Amino acid sequence: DRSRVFDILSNINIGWNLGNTLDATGGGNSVNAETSWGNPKTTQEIVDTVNDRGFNAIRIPVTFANHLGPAPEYTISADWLARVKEVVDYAVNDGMYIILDTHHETNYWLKTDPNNEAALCEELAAIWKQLAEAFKDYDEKLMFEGMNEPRMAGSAKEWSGGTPAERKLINAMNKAFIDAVRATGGNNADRVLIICTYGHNSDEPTLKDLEIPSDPNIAVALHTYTPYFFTYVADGSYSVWNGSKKNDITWQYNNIKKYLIDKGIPVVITETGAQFKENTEDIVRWIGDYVGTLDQDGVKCFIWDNNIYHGNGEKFGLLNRSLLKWYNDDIVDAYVNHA
Numbered sequence: 001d002r003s004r005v006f007d008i009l010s011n012i013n014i015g016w017n018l019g020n021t022l023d024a025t026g027g028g029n030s031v032n033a034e035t036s037w038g039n040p041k042t043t044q045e046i047v048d049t050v051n052d053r054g055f056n057a058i059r060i061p062v063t064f065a066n067h068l069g070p071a072p073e074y075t076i077s078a079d080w081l082a083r084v085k086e087v088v089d090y091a092v093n094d095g096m097y098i099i100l101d102t103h104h105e106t107n108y109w110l111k112t113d114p115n116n117e118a119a120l121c122e123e124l125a126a127i128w129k130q131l132a133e134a135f136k137d138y139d140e141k142l143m144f145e146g147m148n149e150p151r152m153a154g155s156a157k158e159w160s161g162g163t164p165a166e167r168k169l170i171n172a173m174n175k176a177f178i179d180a181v182r183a184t185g186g187n188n189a190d191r192v193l194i195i196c197t198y199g200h201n202s203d204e205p206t207l208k209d210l211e212i213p214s215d216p217n218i219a220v221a222l223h224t225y226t227p228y229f230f231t232y233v234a235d236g237s238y239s240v241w242n243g244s245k246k247n248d249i250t251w252q253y254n255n256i257k258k259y260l261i262d263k264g265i266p267v268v269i270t271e272t273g274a275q276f277k278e279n280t281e282d283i284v285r286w287i288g289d290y291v292g293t294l295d296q297d298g299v300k301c302f303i304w305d306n307n308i309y310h311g312n313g314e315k316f317g318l319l320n321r322s323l324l325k326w327y328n329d330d331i332v333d334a335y336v337n338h339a
Ligand SMILES: OC[C@H]1O[C@@H](O)[C@H](O)[C@@H](O)[C@@H]1O
Pocket: 020, 036, 037, 038, 312, 313
């Protein structure tokens, strides 16, 4: 009976990611990591703006690696832990639903070598112990997402759900995360804990190998930027959305239904979105078909927002943070008015 998790999640309209911010990896062991990829320092007003628009849930991606002391304690630098808490507190002040993750640990120590299971699980646990202790007294609207796209960067199946041995390591790492957090007690005894597949990938073999914990206060996170050739820029990509490719979404969603939804396991899409390709109308239609698909089973999503829109890079930006105005009100309306 996982119903408590379903009830909590039903309160989300739709979510938003503070992308390329606390997850950025420049600046070393410094709070300046936050601004190292060109975003401004986050403020209460940025977060208010997101909330006021209708994204009443926020994912706060955070990369810890360069702020950790040495093994085996892996102590999170006090400055960094305090800045992370300040940022979460912006959302708490506004009554938002919140996901805190670990993020580009995958550039650093989180490399899914099944022969290194103990060192990986131990680091993951040590980090989460400290985070769980710090946010112990936060209420049930704060959720923890243990890993982000855990994988072996550079490997052949990096983006296709890994190998069977790697999928088994992910199960062990998910378990370690849950264990470390539950052991701190307080509100962490039943806080929603969001585990993931390999690479947050949703292909059938990857779902099939996912161990479902007996803990009743968990959800499964996936990233479905689907279809890839619409949302990303690549050889074969297109900017037009007429519905002919809706079946890529449906087929993929049918496996999420088979292994998760129809087994009563809560699922959350913790990242999705479409890069802006001077195709407003197309993106508005894609959101209808993509989010319309998740709405059939009350599945919630969090849209990736890296504040890149006019400039070079992946143009997932929605809020112009420095002006506190939305880059594209029609795309944003389709998200916040999806229901
Ligand atoms: O351009 C903004 C940022 O996008 C990221 O995905 C890249 O890794 C960063 O190097 C880059 O600075």
